[PDB]
Design a protein around this ligand. Structure first.
Ligand code: CDL
Lengths: 81, 68
């Protein structure tokens, strides 16, 4: 079936490659890779983060409320006698 | 004559070529083939419908045997 002899039909594309032993494995990290990671974080920040911030607010609120609910109310004894 | 005087500095007679040929033997072939072919990086060129031409790593790994 699917085999490297007849996958698709292409015309007029040229490629060039070096061998691994001719070139470096980690050529430019701090001059190219770091800024690229930075933009890659920039492009997705506001699509992911705010939902989790909202989750954090909800969690803390619900915890606080549950913990208030367990403390004794002075009006339950002071009001009528 | 012309090519020889440019490349070698001198005409090499057929007798000398015969003497050089007579010295080769299977041991010499083994040695020299190993000296230029075995575990080396090749240069490759392809033109045409060449989807099935193996990847360069696959070609490089074909230049040596694991059982040797
Ligand atoms: C578990 C988790 C799973 C999930 C993980 C998730 C993540 C996974 C991600 C990764 C996925 C990877 C997928 C696989 C990729 C495979 C790639 C591939 O195949 O490439 C093809 C690759 C590409 O080349 P090609 O283009 O096809 O060209 C073919 C040419 O012929 C090329 O010619 P060549 O000469 O260059 O190479 C040929 C030769 C190259 O190999 C060699 O010549 C030797 C290689 C190094 C030495 C290995 C020797 C192992 C010997 C057997 C174990 C005994 C060791 C000693 C202890 C003795 C104990 C009594 O290899 C062979 O002929 C194949 C067999 C080699 C071993 C010989 C023994 C065969 C029988 C095995 C069963 C024995 C059971 C009984 C054992 C005794 C009793 C306990 O070529 C190969 O043929 C590669 C060979 C790979 C062999 C692997 C052998 C593994 C098994 C070892 C034994 C296990 C049993 C041990 C039992 C306990 C005793 C110790």
């Amino acid at each position: 079936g699917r085999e490297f002899g007849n996958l698709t039909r292409i015309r007029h594309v040229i490629s060039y490659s070096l061998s691994p032993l001719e070139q470096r494995a980690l050529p430019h990290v701090l001059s190219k890779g770091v800024p690229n990671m930075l933009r890659r974080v920039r492009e997705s920040f506001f699509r992911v983060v705010p939902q989790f911030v909202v989750f954090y607010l909800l969690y803390t609120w619900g915890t606080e409320e549950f913990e208030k609910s367990k403390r004794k109310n002075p009006a339950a004894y002071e009001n009528d006698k | 004559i012309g090519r020889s005087l440019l490349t070698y500095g001198r005409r090499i007679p057929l007798a000398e070529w015969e003497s050089r040929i007579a010295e080769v033997d299977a041991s010499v072939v083994r040695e020299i083939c190993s000296k230029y072919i075995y575990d080396q990086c090749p240069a490759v060129a392809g033109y045409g419908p060449i989807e099935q031409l193996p990847d360069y790593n696959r070609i490089r790994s074909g230049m040596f045997w694991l059982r040797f």
